Amino acid sequence: YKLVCYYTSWSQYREGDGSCFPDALDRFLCTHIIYSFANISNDHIDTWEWNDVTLYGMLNTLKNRNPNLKTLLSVGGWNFGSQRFSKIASNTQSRRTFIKSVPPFLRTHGFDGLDLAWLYPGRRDKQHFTTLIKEMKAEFIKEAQPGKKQLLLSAALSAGKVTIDSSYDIAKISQHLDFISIMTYDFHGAWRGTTGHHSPLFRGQEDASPDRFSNTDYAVGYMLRLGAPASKLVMGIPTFGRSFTLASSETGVGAPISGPGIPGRFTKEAGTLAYYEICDFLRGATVHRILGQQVPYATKGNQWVGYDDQESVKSKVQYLKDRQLAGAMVWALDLDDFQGSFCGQDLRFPLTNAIKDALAAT
């Protein structure tokens, strides 16, 4: 199975033990590591961070002792702006310039492929997205025609039904992509005004779901039936949780909230907590297993956070294997306990290793 893991270039700036650099990654942990994110300037793919060239090398160095490890560079990301991506993909000239600039850039920096993270095409860009993927793959095939190891092309896609229906032509793009990472998390925003797990495996209590489509199982099934081959589908599993600030004594699923949770010490983003930060949070907290959804939430004081742990990722892997999917995708390596000192056990990347062991099990 494929174990696609993301590394974010901004995790380096986190205070203390939160700072994560590529060299802190286990070269034998994943089968694919994706660097996030590359920018696009003057219609050319380009670096984002001032020291990306250095970090690129730091990441690719991992391949020296592990020749089977593949690496990809992701372009886009939530903070990229679908608007900019649209202008480039819709304009015939800009699209060509961009596509042509990718192979040289990837070979120059030691990458094995490109990951498209356009979040997200609009109803207006559905076809453009298809064309972009189709032509990019063409260029990759051409660039390797002489006899090179062809560059890989993947895409991180939304797991939301509304976005999927308006942005993607699953059947068409599935043919050109080497693999699709479905982002099966972020299913329950603080805006919804109630507590909810952002990455449940199944819908669960039919009574307590704000919507039947907001769960991992529905997204996987839906995409499969839309025409994405199981052998090309990689299921996303989060190593971070979504938090809320409770508004009353109620602490169950669907309880009243006043907004996102208090920012984590290292990630410093209201509504988000890295797994290592959750392990701290767990001290003195109560953990509940959501029956039906197969995932846990933890609550303490006026805080509540839905996340994934060793037990739940194991179940999710069991699920993807039963569905004969290509494997799992992890977002992100730097949100797992990479130091291995927060969740005790001294084990590094506890959630990602749990996923790896589960994929090899049976």
Ligand X SMILES: CC(=O)N[C@@H]1[C@@H](O)[C@H](O[C@@H]2O[C@H](CO)[C@@H](O[C@@H]3O[C@H](CO)[C@@H](O[C@H]4O[C@H](CO)[C@@H](O)[C@H](O)[C@H]4NC(C)=O)[C@H](O)[C@H]3NC(C)=O)[C@H](O)[C@H]2NC(C)=O)[C@@H](CO)O[C@H]1O
Ligand Y SMILES: *[C@@H]1O[C@H](CO)[C@@H](O[C@@H]2O[C@H](CO)[C@@H](O)[C@H](O)[C@H]2NC(C)=O)[C@H](O)[C@H]1NC(C)=O
Q: Smallest gap, in angstroms, from Cβ of residue 153 to ligand Y?
A: 21
81 scored as a contact of ligand X (CB under 6 A)? no
Q: Which of 1, 7, 48, 244 binds ligand Y (CB under 6 A)?
A: 48
d(CA 158, CA 192): 18
By beta-carbon proximity to ligand X, the closer residue of 130 and 167 is 167
283 is an annotated ligand-binding site residue: no
Token code pair at residue 184: 């099966």
Contact (Cβ atoms closer than 8 angstroms) between residue 125 and residue 167? yes
The kind and range of the H/E element at 276 are helix 275-281
CA 96 from centroid of its chain's CA atoms: 27
Q: Check residue 78 for interaction with ligand X (CB under 6 A).
A: yes
- Is residue 79 within the footprint of ligand X (CB under 6 A)? yes
Q: Which listed range, 76-84, 167-175, 224-232, 256-264, lies at the site for ligand X (CB under 6 A)?
A: 76-84
- Asked if residue 41 binds ligand Y (CB under 6 A), the reply is yes
Task: Work out whether 158 is an interface residue with ligand X (CB under 6 A).
Answer: yes
Residues 6+ apart with CB under 8 A from 58: 21, 22, 23
Q: Is 78 part of any known ligand binding site? A: yes
First to last CA, the chain: 13
Which one, 50 or 191, has the nearer CB to ligand Y?
A: 50
What is the nearest approach in angstroms of ligand X to the Cβ of residue 6? 6
50 is in an annotated binding site: yes
- Judged by CB under 6 A, the stretch of 61-69, 74-82, 140-148, 258-266 that binds ligand X is 74-82
* 1-20 positions binding ligand X, by CB under 6 A: 6
List beta partners, residue 179.
154
Element (H or E) spanning 53, and its range? Answer: helix 52-60
Contact 19, 12 (CB under 8 A): yes
For the bound state, the minimum distance from the C-beta of residue 42 to ligand Y, rounded and expressed in Å, comes to 7
CB of residue 91 vs ligand Y: minimum separation in angstroms? 13
- Which of 78, 104, 103, 84 lies closest to 43, judged by CA? 84
Does 185 belong to an annotated binding site? yes
Q: Give SS3 for 160.
A: coil
**Is 311 assigned to a binding site?**
no
CB atoms within 10 A of CB 321: 16
| Residue 109, φ and ψ in degrees, nearest 5 | -105, 10
Among 160, 200, 264, 296, binds ligand X (CB under 6 A): 160
Name the DSSP class of 256.
Answer: B
Residue of 117, 153, 173, 330 interacting with ligand X (CB under 6 A): 117
User: SS3 for 106?
Assistant: helix
293 binds ligand X (CB under 6 A): no
Task: Find tokens 């992701």 and name the residue.
Answer: 74
Q: How far apart are CA 144 and CA 146, in angstroms?
A: 5
Over the range 178-216, which residues count as b (16 or more CB within 10 Å of their CB) and which as e?
bbbbbbbbbbbebeeebbbbbbbbbbbeeeebeeeebbb
**Residue 10 labelled as part of a binding site:** no
Is residue 57 a contact partner of residue 96, using CB atoms and an 8 Å limit? no
Cβ pair 151, 140 in contact under 8 A: yes
Q: Which does 48 bind (CB under 5 to 8 A by kind): ligand X, ligand Y, none?
A: ligand Y
Pick what 77 binds: ligand Y, ligand X, none; C-beta below 5 to 8 Å, kind-dependent: ligand X
Residue 39 interacts with ligand Y (CB under 6 A): yes or no:
yes
85 lines the binding site for ligand X (CB under 6 A): no
Question: Residues 208-237: x/- map of binding to ligand X (CB under 6 A)?
Answer: ------x-----------------------
Q: Which residues are annotated as a binding site for chitin?
A: 49-50, 76-79, 120, 183-186, 242, 331
- Using CB under 6 A as the criterion, which residues of the chain lie in contact with ligand X when the complex forms? 6, 77-79, 117, 119, 156, 158-160, 163, 183, 186-187, 189, 214, 240, 269, 272, 331-332, 335
Provide the annotated binding site: 49-50, 76-79, 120, 183-186, 242, 331
Residues that bind ligand Y (CB under 6 A): 39, 41, 48, 84
